[model samples]
Target chain A: TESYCGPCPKNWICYKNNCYQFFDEEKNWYESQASCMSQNASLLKVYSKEDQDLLKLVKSYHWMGLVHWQWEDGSSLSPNLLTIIEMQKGDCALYASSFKGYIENCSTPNTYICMQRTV
Target chain B: TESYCGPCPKNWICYKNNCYQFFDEEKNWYESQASCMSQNASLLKVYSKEDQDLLKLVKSYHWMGLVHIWQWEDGSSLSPNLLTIIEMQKGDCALYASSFKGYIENCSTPNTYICMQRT
Candidate 1:
């Protein structure tokens, strides 16, 4: 058994010093973000390719923090943060193992991921 | 982790083949029960002293699975040998805290809660 330490607020997964929640329910991008907000968290923000790989832990396409080339926090995604397979003027991004990260219309409903700092 | 082959759902703490989720938000006992039901879970039920200690992972004063008759949500009255509780009067709703193990509270009073499910 692994020794437990620190906190993540719930059954939350403590990974790389961040707490994450992957909701199995479907919701639009806005609704998904709102759900995360209700929990005092934000839609997933992929910090590194290795970290982005964590999305695979939950097998589903999910809304991440990226939308229209901007992150929900109004921050710029790091250079080459993800090799977005396709793009257009839009306000949503869908992450799955296939594309790793791809563009999608925000209105389309899908499961989502949320995260918050762990300290 | 450990083959990851089981049905505890997302972000759930799997302890002794049971799934648990501890919340940081506050809701009255009734509302708290509803919240867990919405997620296909039930409020926390402590079946042993060690599990009661396990439930101490976070925020306190949480609405758990016990109610008026010292009965659990599943309709089984608490076992005298499993654990013990306190004295109380009408409309008995219980709350768990490290300080007292557990005690009664008005069902309508807002409080944190824990959710659980058997796998």
Candidate 2:
């Protein structure tokens, strides 16, 4: 589920209408979002099914575009849109695999994904 | 998520525009729907924020009033809608649990159920 159009900046793969880069090193949730922000991107957001399809290849969990369980855009996450498991509700979310996400404390460290729209 | 409903038809709890009953015992999907239909009610359909809150109180898995990838027994749709956290295949049916949002398991697998009707 990718388009061969808009070129991606180095290390970020172009997929569908956006470009994304996965960071395997662990960092606190805020640090992850900030890192993506530094790159002129946001943490990953599941805006389309194609995004989920790409995330399926992720073998381990990582931070995604959420804060206090809400998407970075400030809209509440829709249960119908993503499968979030709160091992007891808290802040931050990790893209576990497939479309599944797990809610956890924002201070915890984890790998992450960064995303940006294509030109 | 209950509002006391003015008062339900005995044994039913009211919340928002409907009254509901949760059956803790397991039963096949068809039987559960038939049982609810006999009561002049239908299997539970989460149609409101109130409904979701009540469903969040459920401690175990239960059948929802949906068939297909999602059609309620009353012939209404539950999709365009959009997980406890499972991949859906043919013959799977929707379910609810306090442990997770929405889930799907084989229709033949027995689980608790919820019934609901207009208040």
Candidate 3:
């Protein structure tokens, strides 16, 4: 397993001392989360402006480690989150150019990102 | 039918004398283009830096009118467009982002999109 101090694995982006990969495959929110967990990671968690800003560059509906009202780790959402437009009722979250921090139905298929800390 | 001068239907943003809406529903590139046509619009065109900047704020994978190589369904290209990263095979489709600039990805990938037009 990779640690926080090691270089990112091949094809994964090293940002803020973490390894993140934007998976090309499409899956529903639950499936995406499971996929990340299968690799010893989890869906991305946006806890700061840098995390949000870095993801703003992505052009797909990638899953984040957030449910409708909270983080997957049971943490409450930060008030400083980017603008979010609640489009549907679902326990999953994703970000995009037009809509940031948008809640989405968990069954919909879309690309996802997986993340793990370097340390 | 509403004329171009009329206000955009609800949930659409007005910018540069045009109305634009980003749909959260996921669809393939062709389907996304078709969806825009159904709404009397077409996939987005990057004719200027302003357009790109406006879309840079969006957070989802939305199809643009540009196709592989250099075809544009919207019939416009950047006078000096942002750089593009060809991440996939030829004959693939284009996606726009603030960081990726412009990119080529599978046309079959289903994802949310945006539509805009004068009317």
Candidate 4:
């Protein structure tokens, strides 16, 4: 039984009954997070209850709301947040854009992927 | 002396008293237009009423909602429609991503330029 099951809206990726928009296009780590927050969203929320299944369910490559690499302020992240978005890569907290799948610069001007809530 | 004026939305470009989101990215002729309508906008409207000076005001390269090239149905555009977006070009009806400014493939990773209606 699912409350909502259909094509997700533009800029959003439907995950676990929730919609998320990983600004994977560009923008520094900090500005990326700011864009999300400007829309009232924070680094994507990977609930604690979702661990193994979430990882497996997600496509092999998907950007999440976590910056273990660079802080929005361009400073190194603190040690407190070991893992962001359930994955702890420290320097890997950055969005996943260089995964050999596609290469794009932060300001290269490409389509953006946004996410909004859906039931 | 403006009814509405502010920064345009993410996928939209603000122009002569209007906001538009031109699909100036990948996707063939038909599909590109489809992406625009999927968001409730058409190829684009030049609103003839505001011509002449309007053209002079727009920056050198700005995408508009006018198509004189391929059709959404995958058909060749008719020659009757000479000037599109106040300009004319056979295959040039396509987006202007190859103007010596940037080199990006239609399928390559890059940022997209979209314009939305603004006040």
Residue B79 accuracy (lDDT) in model 2? 47
Candidate 4 wrongly placed segments (more than 4 Å):
A5-11, A48-63, A67-92, A95-119, B1-119
Residue B89 in candidate 1, Cα distance off native in Å: 54
What are the TM-scores, per candidate, against the unseen true structure?
0.47, 0.46, 0.47, 0.28
After superposition, candidate 1 runs with Cα above 4 Å error: A1-5, A51-53, A56-58, A87-89, B1-119
Q: Tens-digit lDDT track for model 1 on A10-93?
A: 455554446667776889899999999999899988777664444444345788988878789998888856678664346689
- Return the lDDT, model 4, position B65: 38
Model 3 TM-score relative to the real fold: 0.47
Task: For each candidate in the order shown, give its overall lDDT on alpha carbons.
Answer: 0.70, 0.68, 0.66, 0.36
List DockQ, one per candidate, in order.
Answer: 0.03, 0.01, 0.03, 0.02
A1-119: candidate 2 lDDT, tens digit per residue: 11132344534444443666767668988899999999989998876654446455455778898776678978777766678788535678888766888888788888888987754
lDDT of 3 by residue, A1-119 (tens): 11122244443444445666677678998899899888878888777775334454456567788886787778887887767777678777776653387788989888887887655
Per-residue C-alpha lDDT of model 1 across residues B10-108, encoded as one tens digit per residue: 456544446666666789998999999998899988777654444443334689889985788999887665544654734578887653366777888
lDDT of 3 at A21: 67
- Model 2 residue-pair collision total: 4
Each model's TM-score for chain A is 0.82, 0.85, 0.82, 0.42
Candidate 1 chain A has its poorest 10 consecutive residues by lDDT at A1-10
TM-score of chain B of each: 0.81, 0.79, 0.77, 0.40
